[PDB]
Amino acid sequence: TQPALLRLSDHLLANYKKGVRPVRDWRKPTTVSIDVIMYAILNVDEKNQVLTTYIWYRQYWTDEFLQWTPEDFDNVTKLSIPTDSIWVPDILINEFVDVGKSPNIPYVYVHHRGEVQNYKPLQLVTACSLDIYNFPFDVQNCSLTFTSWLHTIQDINITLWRSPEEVRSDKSIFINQGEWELLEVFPQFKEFSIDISNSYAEMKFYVIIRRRPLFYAVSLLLPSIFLMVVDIVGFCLPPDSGERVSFKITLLLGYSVFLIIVSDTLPATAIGTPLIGVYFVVCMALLVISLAETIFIVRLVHKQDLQRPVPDWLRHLVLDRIAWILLAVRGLLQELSSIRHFLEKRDEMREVARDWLRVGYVLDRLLFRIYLLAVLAYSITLVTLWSIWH
Amino acid sequence: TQPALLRLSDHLLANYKKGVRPVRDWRKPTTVSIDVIMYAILNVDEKNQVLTTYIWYRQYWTDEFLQWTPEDFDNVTKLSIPTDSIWVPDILINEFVDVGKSPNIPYVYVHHRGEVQNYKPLQLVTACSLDIYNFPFDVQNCSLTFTSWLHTIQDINITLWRSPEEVRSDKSIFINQGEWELLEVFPQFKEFSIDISNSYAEMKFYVIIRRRPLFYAVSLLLPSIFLMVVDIVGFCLPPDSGERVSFKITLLLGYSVFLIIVSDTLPATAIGTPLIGVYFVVCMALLVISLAETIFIVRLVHKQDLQRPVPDWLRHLVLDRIAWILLAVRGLLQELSSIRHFLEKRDEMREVARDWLRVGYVLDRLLFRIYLLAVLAYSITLVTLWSIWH
Amino acid sequence: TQPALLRLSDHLLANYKKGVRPVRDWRKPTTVSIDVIMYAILNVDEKNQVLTTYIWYRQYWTDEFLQWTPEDFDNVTKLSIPTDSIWVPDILINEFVDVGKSPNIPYVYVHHRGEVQNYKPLQLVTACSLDIYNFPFDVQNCSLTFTSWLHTIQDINITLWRSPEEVRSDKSIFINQGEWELLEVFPQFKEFSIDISNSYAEMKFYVIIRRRPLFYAVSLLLPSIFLMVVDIVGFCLPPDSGERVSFKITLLLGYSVFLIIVSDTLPATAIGTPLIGVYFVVCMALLVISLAETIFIVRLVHKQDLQRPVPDWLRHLVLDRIAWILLAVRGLLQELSSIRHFLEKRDEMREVARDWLRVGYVLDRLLFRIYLLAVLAYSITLVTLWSIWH
Amino acid sequence: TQPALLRLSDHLLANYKKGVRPVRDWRKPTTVSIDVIMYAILNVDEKNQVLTTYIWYRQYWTDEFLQWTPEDFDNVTKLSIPTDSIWVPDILINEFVDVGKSPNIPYVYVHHRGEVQNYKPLQLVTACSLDIYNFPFDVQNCSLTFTSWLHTIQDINITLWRSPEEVRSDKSIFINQGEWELLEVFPQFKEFSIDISNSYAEMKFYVIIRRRPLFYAVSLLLPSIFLMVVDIVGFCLPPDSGERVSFKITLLLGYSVFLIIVSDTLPATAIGTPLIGVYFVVCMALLVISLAETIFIVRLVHKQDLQRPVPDWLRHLVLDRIAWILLAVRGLLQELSSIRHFLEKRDEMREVARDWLRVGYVLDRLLFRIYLLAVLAYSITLVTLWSIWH
């Protein structure tokens, strides 16, 4: 007479207590079968070490009070029952540090043998240990531990809806083209217990994610390479021009402000700084070495009246070995003699300055070649290190 | 006797179970008809790849328990019933990554034949794949998938309130003068199923939005064009002035800090960087070429005592082809001869410096003309590329 | 015997259905009277085009079930009834894009003739079209539309508690000394309908707000005026000092970084950039013109050995019109003749350089006077434009 | 037989209506006594003019239905009753602009004569007029107004739990070592009414808070003093060095970027800018005056061939008053005469340059002393202004 669904709901939900664990025998536990599918990785924050993810969570447990024979209710084998009208296990993650805002699913499926299926999306804000030692190429290993917060293993036990390999290989609906790439979700079962009898069943899903380094390529490689290129270009200025040192100090200031600004996007952790800091300080050291070379050559070639003739050893070395590597008539005569003396003194000072300038030019050429070779070696080493990771 | 609305509500809502799917026959599904109208696009986030929109959502389904004959209730054909007192389908979006804060509508309209109409505004925070390859002019294609989270197609099915063309052409109440322009909302129906029998009905609304490029015109074109203009202006400084290199390095530092600052507003994605990065690095390369030309000409024209006479080939080439393209009396005599020798040496050095300066000036003029032509060609290419898109 | 309030509440709220529209005749609508008073303008966001305001909202409608005769209840004419125990119209704003967090008022006043008065504070996050074409002095015109989300005009109709002039003139409790100044709140009634019979009653309150320009006076006028002042000061440096160009380029870099930083506080919209951008780029053009003038004069006065005597036309023009507007004895003789020749050549080069320097100085004086006049004219024009708006 | 608490709760809460104002006579009001204790000042935002505070709020009113004789219930004189089971006045603050997240207290104490005590912590986000005219040393005067949102003075009246002096002197549990120091909380009672009969009782607590200036001492005084010190140091460079103007312009750029950056932490209001802006622009004007003095002296001492002998008046003044304040033999003769003429011309130019350099040096010394005296006077004035405030 009455609709089958209405009669079934009246038969089930009448005198049904939602605060009672649904077992006819209190000794057996309610085995909750669990399944997790990753949807998206909303945020990985290396500063506070929290991982924000969106997952599709489903679970099913056998409710021994929501049972009926289909033949008495017009052959209905399953129906939807509100989640607030039945007992629901309190399965939640240990790693929680903040409650996620997720849509509330008001209905759950109940079968004629008691199986209750609960589908629900969950947004998770979980704490994790984020090691950024390989920051541009780091692969993270985050853990999600689903366990009952109160019930022991003798009340609520947790298993997997699907085989572990199927959960591992599930990468169908994951949002992929973001910053973080999901590798696998590995489920593992352990019994957490710090007491002889208080054993708690937990299910650990090791969410393994790999960062995509192409995000930071333009941000990191381009400015440093550009500034080394302009350093090489500016090395060509003559040392005695009087502007080479200004060029070098301006370039060093530019690199310093670049490093200080990029430090806002480079994370840090307690165990250690990311390894690319070593490369950045190596580039800083190369720029400082270039500046020191410029200052030394400027010292060599600067023309001041205290200059003395180039020593024999320095002259021979630089200009040979390094080069091959690379009556009132008497009263009238006195005034002319004095004028000639002054001109000779000026000419001798000019010649000494010329010799020092030649030595400085040869040394500058040699040191520029050495610096170019060092820069090429550093770039080749970086390229060959990047290649093996590919 | 009693008011018609009160009697109707008592007749309907008495012994009415809100946890039961409203069908007299459990085999037929409840066909939920759906309609979506876009109101505003609150935020498009290219970093986390989430789209925030506000939509006006209405749905109607046939409730087979909320039926009456109007003649028995003073000819009432419809009435408002609280949303919490009736069964409501759990239609929600798959793309959800965060629950939106939207006003709660407490009433729904119910007709005398069971049709229940639910009007509700929804704020959506949905994940989408944002491709910014054409960042200033990119058109996005975001999907909204409305489906029942639990019920299969044999329980809840989804259709459209209006024809697909009407939903596509709906741009009436959309907030238009913002950053993002709505092109169309294209509805499509698919059956999502990863099981033989567990088929789920879904309705996909492809929200297609086009960015307005005029937002970033002042931010991008103006600084680069201004810095190229000042580069052209500063190219006029004489190479031997001793300040041209300082001008060029200061300009390069300014452009570098501009690029680093503007990188904070330029988004990036895993698949690739926006194409305007190519244009920006081309402008950087042009500035670097200008600096290298300045340094080369400074090398040519710098006056130092090691200068040798201009070679025959270089002199002929630059100054012709490129130009057309563009007794104690004897003792007295000795001192005078020495003075004349010193003056002649200084004059010869000055003349050699003059020849080198002339060659450098001619080369600088030619290279300035070439650089101006290259800049004009680049600007014309950019303008003609912008024209075809208009 | 029993307290009058208890008896009255038992008489009213017993067998009272809160899901029924309170009319004895379903044909007549419930006329809801609305009054709105602005408290504060929490935030006006020109980027996402959302307006955040706090208002004091009160409404009253005639409930035909909450009626009694005072003489039967100890002459009680009004009482407070919980808001959750009575029917409340679902009046809410169309412009909503996010739900506002506002305190919940648990009680409403009910009179003996059915009038139910609902007082409630509301925080509103509404979308609006913000035109910043006159950004420092722009007056905004935001609309708040109160209407029933579900009920048509035949069920719920909306009017005004007070006359439109009284609502317009209400500026008593508004927080005034903030950034935004409230001009008026203009109420207007319209019938929103996109169907023959589905007519919806709405009440539009045009919130008109004017920005106070004194916020940005120090932020905008002071840096630009200061940098023009230092440009005028630095124009006094001699062109041949060798540091005027460095001064000008440093000043231009400072103005560029100022503009880039201040762009973070200058909003932009799709329809167009704020008009003060024109003034800012005019200041940029004036600085660039100053730099170009400095470079031109440096070109004129720079002393290099390729200098030729000043042409007759240029000399006459600049130095008149612009100025008015503003035997071994023979062997001994040969060496002396050669020395005299060298000294004469050097003196002639020095004299040519002196003539060119004089011409450059006169031209620099004239162009400095012209630039000062142009700057004064620009400042006077800005002051006059500001005065007429006052 | 039964427990005393259970019997008392059954006697009280049975047939008890929580929607009725608890008075046997509706003519008398429920006098709510209010006490407020400040816990912490979470945030004072001068931009949006909102004050965030945490307070400990307690109130007690006489409930005439929750009365019993202790002798009938095992001498129980008080008990805890859930807040949701009794009538609670809707006392809330007018100044609210956002609802505060505060813990919910589920129990209230009820005495045997009806006194109901409600203890609750409250987080308040209230709008206030923040005058920052004395920004580093400003004392704010914020108002908290507790009143019933609906009930008039004939229904709910408000008084103080403690005497006003006790509320004023309460600074025990306030968090003190933060940025803001609490001076006093002054309670005042007023009757808010804009109608003859609609009088509302309100209680205003004037929260008076004084900012601690030691927060911004390092941020403001240190950079300006340091840049003044380096300005004084750089004033010692010789004017003819050719780098003094570059030093001054670099220093000016540094101060400009410092001011622009510190503007991000200096708030502004509609009524007026903070007074320390005057001091900052005075420092800026001092730096500009130093730059102008440097440029003027550079103009005086610059050596160019157009220099003319120092005028008699300038020479006398600067160098006295300011200083005290601080045959082929004839053919042979012609060539020597010409050489002597050239040397004499060069020597005369050098002597004129020397005289101008001496005048410039004396003037530079005098102006440096004047500038040092002005800087010392400004620093002394600032110190003596700070002393009187201490």
Place this chain on the structure above:
Amino acid sequence: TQPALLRLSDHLLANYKKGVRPVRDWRKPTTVSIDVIMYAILNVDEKNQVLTTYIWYRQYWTDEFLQWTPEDFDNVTKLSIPTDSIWVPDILINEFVDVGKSPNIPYVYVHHRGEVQNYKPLQLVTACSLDIYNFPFDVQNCSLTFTSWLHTIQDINITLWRSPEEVRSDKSIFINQGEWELLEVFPQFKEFSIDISNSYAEMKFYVIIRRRPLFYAVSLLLPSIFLMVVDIVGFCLPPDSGERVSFKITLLLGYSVFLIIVSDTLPATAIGTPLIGVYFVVCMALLVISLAETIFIVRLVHKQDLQRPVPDWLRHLVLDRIAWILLAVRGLLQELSSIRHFLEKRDEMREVARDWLRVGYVLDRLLFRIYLLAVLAYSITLVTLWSIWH
């Protein structure tokens, strides 16, 4: 017949009042035992002085109404009861300034003797006094005070689940690899009372946390050390080069912008600035002393025509003590005499300049050695200060 759990729940929760404190005798209090385990320190905020932590909180109290004999219910000794169906003490923290978002645990364990165990995770936003006097190495001492907000010690009393040593030594599940290291959690019991009879029981957990200084090592030590190194490198430039002062001022500008930027990450408090500010201003003073030395030596060695011969005392001192520490024939003769006079004057000026340059060079060498020794002493002092803390 019926399931044991259902019968037990019916026996307990029937006619059970959840608003009544569960004691058969109202004179005895409900002794709540408290245990707290720290999970993670989400955020320590020194600006607003708030501490955000996640803790695992469990409590148990004896409910005298939830008691049964196991033999009558199939030997059930414990069961799970919903938290909303029983009386729960209102234990919450005094230090709260904002409510934390934590998962809600819906079940609590109840034993057959009345013991009710409540497990719950809590996110705490508590105010604390953060002293950053030793900012890089500071250890904080934050207090968490658990007490009943309403009930006095005669109603609810608080003790510890475990011994204080066990609570102190608990560092098992704390997230350790973050910025903050947990030292211990020290529980202490006090009776808070400001009245003769209104005594409140409270339990204080002194959360003691130590910051890990390795976070800021790269951010602080590296830039200052690098800028000192480049200062030492640039000290080698010859004083008469004309670019040493420009190098020094550019370096000072770089250090100034570094300090201004790093001030954004250096917190400040009312009681005092962090001690590393002293070291930073010492580095500033060292750089300023270097600049002043450079300016002084530039003054000494600058060549201008007003130079006078080096005084006897200065010459002797610097060049000895500091060095050891480190007829028409007559008409023909007149012209030659005049030429010789001019050449002699120029030579004498050159010789005076040479002597002054020698003195300046010796003084510059000595002062560079002194500055290097001072820098080495400062670095050694910093290293030895860091060693003793290790």
